[PDB]
Design a binder for this molecule. Structure first.
Ligand SMILES: O=c1[nH]c2cc(C(F)(F)F)c(N3CCOCC3)cc2n(CP(=O)(O)O)c1=O
Ligand SMILES: O=c1[nH]c2cc(C(F)(F)F)c(N3CCOCC3)cc2n(CP(=O)(O)O)c1=O
Lengths: 127, 49, 49, 149, 151
């Protein structure tokens, strides 16, 4: 059971033929050795006549087109990024200056010094 | 008000968003599988990223 | 489970799985028509959901 | 030999050049499908000719007349040889003409107005209560000071 | 229900929602077919005017490549969100019974495995466009507070 099982059921429904769900022996997808020039896996099963049709996630490449044929891709995909879910991490000392400002605290301190200097210049210049 | 806003929602976000985020930093590592066409895609690529 | 990871970013290349048939087979064109019929009816997206 | 290559004026696939009246032959156009057909002619090695469709239609089968139009009708009735254009591969188009493997996947997306950080300055300060209750607050302030004095 | 949305008045886009079996997209086509006033536009630029004069109150649905290309054009005031709703793709067309179609498809697979298609995609969408390199930026995610009140 799974996705490709129901996909093969839909193919047999819209095409009208008996099927036989078989398992590949070595568990390999498909490869051609440079020495033997022999395709293995389900590719070798289709080339050497061991199988009739393969309904499985096999990557359509150019080197596989040279021996067998491929239909239009039913499921498009690509390369994605697997990261973990961002949970809460311990912020620590950075929580003292975390909200509302990263640089404006120094502006508050500078305005504090400025208001202090102006208040001293007003309060200590009357004579 | 802003500290109540932080303590209210607490919607943490992800640091990595795009594919250029991997090249933009070096602290968070990233890897692929040791064998397969995925590593061959990066080995045969011509994009400088 | 444990629902602890997530995927970010768009696809980096153009990959796609399709039905494989041997060369010189008669069933390849009706299989292609059946795949196009299942794609246009959205039953593939129903099984994907 | 020869070979007719047809397309339609669509951005950014087929674009007019700046000096299009100062150009001739196949180099009058530019874009994605132009360099795509150039790469196909490089990897195959044949002579081609870029053609523009007349009706401006992509492809449709009028069921009353049972006749395809556009570049589909060009390929069926032999008005063109190879169609390099962003044409959507459907079920009704496979039975009349062949197709290659899909080179660019796409789908239906959502377009929004893309809101920016349009935050005003001093006007954002007097936002949360009002711009008119504060005047009554200052008036009650000076009134209570009059009461104290 | 506040931000309305629509598609083009003619094409396979409207036929996709009209022939959809998913109840979410069926409710979408039910809302767009019973909208007051009509959300459908005649051309692409009509939808552009309907989006740009809405200030975030109306959206438009289209193909992802055209959406990203409009995102890569001035005044850089659009963006594409979400994943694709269907699996569509363009291919090279040839008539049935033609001998050149299989070597053309071989050349297409050769250009796809060599990544030159992605090179042309980076050339004619990212480099040619009049928008800067984005998707995110100088950390535009507002963490703490705007400084305009403080200023
Ligand atoms: O034809 C191929 N089809 C493949 C199909 C799949 C899967 F997704 F499971 F369908 C995978 N995996 C990807 C992640 O999960 C584990 C295995 C690898 C495949 N490979 C090896 P590649 O060379 O790395 O592409 C092929 O060759
Ligand atoms: O075969 C088809 N190929 C199409 C290719 C394109 C694109 F390549 F993106 F230019 C577009 N556009 C997307 C929306 O804005 C106008 C142009 C429409 C196409 N249509 C019409 P559909 O019926 O709406 O799909 C077809 O029929």
């Amino acid at each position: 059971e799974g996705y490709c099982v129901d996909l093969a059921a839909e193919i047999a429904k819209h095409c009208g033929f008996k099927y036989k769900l078989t398992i590949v022996g070595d568990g390999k997808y498909g490869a051609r050795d440079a020495d033997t020039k022999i395709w293995n896996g389900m590719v070798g099963e289709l080339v050497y006549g061991k199988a009739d049709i393969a309904i499985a996630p096999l990557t359509i490449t150019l080197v596989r087109e040279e021996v067998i044929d491929f239909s239009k891709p039913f499921m498009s995909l690509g390369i994605s990024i697997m990261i973990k879910k961002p949970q809460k991490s311990k912020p620590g000392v950075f929580s003292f200056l975390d909200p509302l400002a990263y640089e404006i605290w120094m502006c508050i301190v500078f305005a504090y010094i400025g208001v202090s200097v102006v208040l001293f210049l007003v309060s200590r210049f009357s004579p | 008000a802003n500290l109540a806003a932080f303590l209210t929602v607490e919607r943490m976000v992800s640091p990595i968003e795009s594919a250029e985020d991997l090249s933009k930093q070096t602290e968070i590592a990233y890897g692929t599988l040791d064998s397969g066409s995925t590593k061959e895609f990066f080995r045969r690529s011509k994009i400088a990223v | 489970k444990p629902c602890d990871t997530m995927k970010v970013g768009g696809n980096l290349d153009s990959k796609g799985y399709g039905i494989a048939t041997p060369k010189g087979s008669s069933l390849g064109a009706a299989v292609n028509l059946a795949v196009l019929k299942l794609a246009e009816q959205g039953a593939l997206d129903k099984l994907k959901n | 030999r020869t070979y007719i290559v047809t397309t339609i004026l669509e951005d950014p696939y087929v674009m007019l050049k700046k000096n299009a009246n100062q150009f001739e032959g196949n180099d009058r156009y530019e874009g994605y499908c132009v360099e795509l057909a150039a790469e196909i002619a490089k990897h195959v090695g044949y002579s081609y000719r870029l053609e523009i469709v007349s009706d401006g239609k992509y492809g449709a089968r009028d069921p009353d007349t049972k006749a395809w139009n556009g570049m589909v009708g060009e390929l069926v009735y032999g008005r063109a040889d190879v169609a390099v254009a962003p044409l959507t591969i459907t079920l009704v188009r496979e039975e009349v003409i062949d197709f290659s493997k899909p080179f660019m996947s796409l789908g239906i997306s959502i377009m929004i107005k893309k809101p920016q950080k349009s935050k005003p300055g001093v006007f954002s300060f007097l936002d949360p209560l009002a711009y008119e209750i504060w005047m009554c607050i200052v008036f009650a302030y000076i009134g209570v000071s009059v009461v104290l004095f | 229900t506040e931000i309305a949305y629509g598609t083009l008045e003619a094409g396979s886009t409207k036929e996709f929602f009209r022939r959809s079996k998913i109840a979410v997209f069926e409710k979408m086509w039910t809302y767009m077919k019973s909208a007051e006033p009509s959300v459908f536009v005649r051309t692409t630029e009509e939808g552009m005017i309907r989006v740009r004069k809405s200030k975030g109150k109306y959206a438009y649905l289209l193909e992802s490549t055209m959406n990203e290309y409009i995102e890569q054009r001035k005044p850089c005031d659009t963006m594409k969100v979400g994943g694709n709703l269907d699996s569509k793709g363009y291919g090279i067309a040839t008539p049935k019974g033609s001998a050149l179609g299989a070597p053309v498809n071989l050349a297409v697979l050769k250009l796809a495995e060599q990544g030159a298609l992605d090179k042309l995609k980076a050339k004619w969408w990212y480099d040619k466009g009049e928008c800067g390199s984005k998707d995110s930026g100088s950390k535009d995610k507002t963490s703490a507070l705007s400084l305009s009140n403080v200023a």
